[PDB]
Amino acid sequence: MKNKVQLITYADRLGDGTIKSMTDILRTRFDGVYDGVHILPFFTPFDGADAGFDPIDHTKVDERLGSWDDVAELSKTHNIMVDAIVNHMSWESKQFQDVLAKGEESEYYPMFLTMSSVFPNGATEEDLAGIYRPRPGLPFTHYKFAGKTRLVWVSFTPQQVDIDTDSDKGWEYLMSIFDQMAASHVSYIRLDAVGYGAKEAGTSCFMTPKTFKLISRLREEGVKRGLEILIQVHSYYKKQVEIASKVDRVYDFALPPLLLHALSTGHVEPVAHWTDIRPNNAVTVLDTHDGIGVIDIGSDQLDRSLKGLVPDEDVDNLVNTIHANTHGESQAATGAAASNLDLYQVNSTYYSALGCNDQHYIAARAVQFFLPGVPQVYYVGALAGKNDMELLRKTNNGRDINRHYYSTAEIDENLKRPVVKALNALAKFRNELDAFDGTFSYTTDDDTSISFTWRGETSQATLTFEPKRGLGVDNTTPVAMLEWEDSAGDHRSDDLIANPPVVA
Amino acid sequence: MKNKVQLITYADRLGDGTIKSMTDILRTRFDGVYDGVHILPFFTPFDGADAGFDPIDHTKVDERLGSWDDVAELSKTHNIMVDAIVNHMSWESKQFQDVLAKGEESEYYPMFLTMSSVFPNGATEEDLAGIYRPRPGLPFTHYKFAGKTRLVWVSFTPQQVDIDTDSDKGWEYLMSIFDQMAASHVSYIRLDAVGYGAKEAGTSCFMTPKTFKLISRLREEGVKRGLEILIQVHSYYKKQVEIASKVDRVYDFALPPLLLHALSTGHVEPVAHWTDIRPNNAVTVLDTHDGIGVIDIGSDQLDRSLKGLVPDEDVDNLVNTIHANTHGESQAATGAAASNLDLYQVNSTYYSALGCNDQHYIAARAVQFFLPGVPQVYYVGALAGKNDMELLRKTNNGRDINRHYYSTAEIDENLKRPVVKALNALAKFRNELDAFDGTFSYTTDDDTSISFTWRGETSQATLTFEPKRGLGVDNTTPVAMLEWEDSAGDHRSDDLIANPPVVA
């Protein structure tokens, strides 16, 4: 995977509404800033039950957004990452509809999971209670198979029916997705919710050996087609560390909340410790299209004796801090407060999570870019966006607070903001200084500060992060300084916003 | 149960917000109109997860509303109906809280239902799939009993834990409710969601023989205490007809939708047929504190070959007509559109469902009052209220569209409306003419009109209902005329709004 900053975006929420438009925005407003792009599900349809993650036809681009040719055109200037929704599909798919009509007579009957498919001999309370869940309630919903009420397995919305990834039909379906991406100039594949992909009676059905098998098999298929695979997994940090050595890339989901913690408390020890044990074959982010994950650094939910990267007490303080910095906005969109598939992810833009503090935000992005791994910036964060309360009120979908619709006009207006200009420059810097393609090293000043250093062929850079320099949402004091040497001398920025770094 | 019109209301949504104020409004604004009242759950707390139906302490009046002293005061002028929430209780009750902390070591452990309590030897998909549900999804949620994850049985919100009505602790509790009501001057008891109260592996757990046993037993406990029981049951019409012969009262839930059908299509035949087979030991209503039930007249949800009171297509047109008449308001509050416990009840005030046609509304109330049974008028309907989109947007609880908060000021304002004056006068008429305590009979003019007649000791009255006379939400033509004889001779009204009936 190219070691350049990537943009995560919905094709229709950045620009006029199409892939062509999004492409234009990237090439004319972010040239040299984002050399890669993760286009969120743009298949048929993109506006269903779960914003693209409930595809009726995964291999067909929603004609309202564009075509596969638009993707090919885009590939000429940007490396493309696309999702491979391996765990489920829309109940409105031809396959599932055939099952509703014909039931066991349908050739697609084996393709979908039901309670009996996993528990042919029935189940005890323990069997079902032991299934891992991102929120309270069992993963089943009612559907009629040829007039017979069946309990279909659904990990997320009731409209997203889980497929048997180990069935012939399920596997054929997944491979057709891989073939389509490989023939459409896609460079990377994101395996959505792969941790849920395998079910086995008596297990948690989440990140078990049977899951590792599925992941391993999908990677093989990926290598066969020259595609790199990034797997998405929100879980106890230990599972992320362990699975990392078996795949090309994993997300670094611990950094986002660890940085909010550091920026709000001044404590960097947790960041230093994570730096020392984290998987370095990762894709870094601060914000994503979902809410901010916190169980990603907390104790194991299935066994509280297994502690996280910080005490559970610090996680609760972290969460309450976001609620305070957003004046209740995040509280109104998080968990049971609105429609959500996950109970603990905190719904709020990262910028709002920090109380819209520019120095803290630019600093967080700086640390993100300095830790090993390919960095990604969510489009709302790319424009330092605030919580979209109007959209939340309209849809009641918790995560929409962080899924604002950016018109071309809004983009140009926001591009004038000092903090957005600073991020554009920081991203450009991270793409042009060859030090980031060299050796990494760091030193820590006893829970007070941490310095990240990269040494490359013709340059080197050192970022010093010291949160205690500017605590408070109203803080205007920089909490990050940068020193670097390039082909044109020895430089230094004591304020990434007033003095954005630029490569000679 | 006295054969006088009753009002259904929240103690806090009619007046200043207290039981005392609610009492004052009844006595000073509705004297002779509403002689009895069903006060919706006013226990601790009244503003929890399900507006009073998730009690932490069923035997304690919420201190913010008043005390049992206020209920005694009211009883001096009005016969009071109260709810006996026999199916579940708040997860915050001391009893459940004790179980979470101590698990099996809690003396209340046997009091609550879990999957294993009903399925001790496990369950097949068929077992779980056959459990009747008012909305998709299994009736179970996660709770930790002394650290152990358990699947607790919950028919409604996850905060409402179902009790074992067959356990000693469960029955002891229910009897504490009955004892409190009998010792607090309550006259009637409404058995809430009693159709769900009995669970048995292999059965639907809804209105089954085991349910009949529970009802029969609860009725005995009422009889022993001098309390009359009304059971709330929303089901395939035949089930209401059958259970009626075993209890004092049942609601007439078929009439509300049958009248909307009649007023919209002009077909009265369905009403004539219902009049012929309906349980006459009923409590009549148009609107309730819940949504408008339509499965109450449609085909059986389990077996569709068991037809309803009108063809299915007609039930569909009825639902669509309400959505059209409210110009999408009811659609935004119904089913999956907002938080709801029942997928098919249509959320709209009865007035709004009728396109606010005053003549249609007053005629509907007239038919309600003329069919055998004790009439109840929901408070929103008592003031001919429209859908409250403000409240709906604020809470996102679908049924809130029909749960407006009426201050004393707004009440008096509404009392000046001609249709509201007409309803008060009609209710007073229904309470003063002794014809309603005599013999009932009706004649029908083949699907076009139907006349209801009552003959008493010193009076007689005949209501002729003919929707065809003035169809449309925009019509001003009366669709009901009244003729009666009292101590002053013969009288007549061809317009219940312009010329309300007054007993000599």
Ligand SMILES: OC[C@H]1O[C@@](CO)(O[C@H]2O[C@H](CO)[C@@H](O)[C@H](O)[C@H]2O)[C@@H](O)[C@@H]1O
């Ligand atoms: O809040 C979303 C919820 O789902 C997870 C599972 O990994 O995220 C991915 O899968 C969902 C179902 O396809 C999508 O809605 C979501 O957009 C996607 O990233 C976690 O983020 C969380 O548990």
Ligand SMILES: OC[C@H]1O[C@@](CO)(O[C@H]2O[C@H](CO)[C@@H](O)[C@H](O)[C@H]2O)[C@@H](O)[C@@H]1O
């Ligand atoms: O829409 C509510 C849903 O519940 C029923 C069950 O009879 O109504 C009663 O019980 C609920 C849970 O206590 C209450 O929320 C509701 O207010 C009460 O009348 C049906 O009307 C429907 O299926």
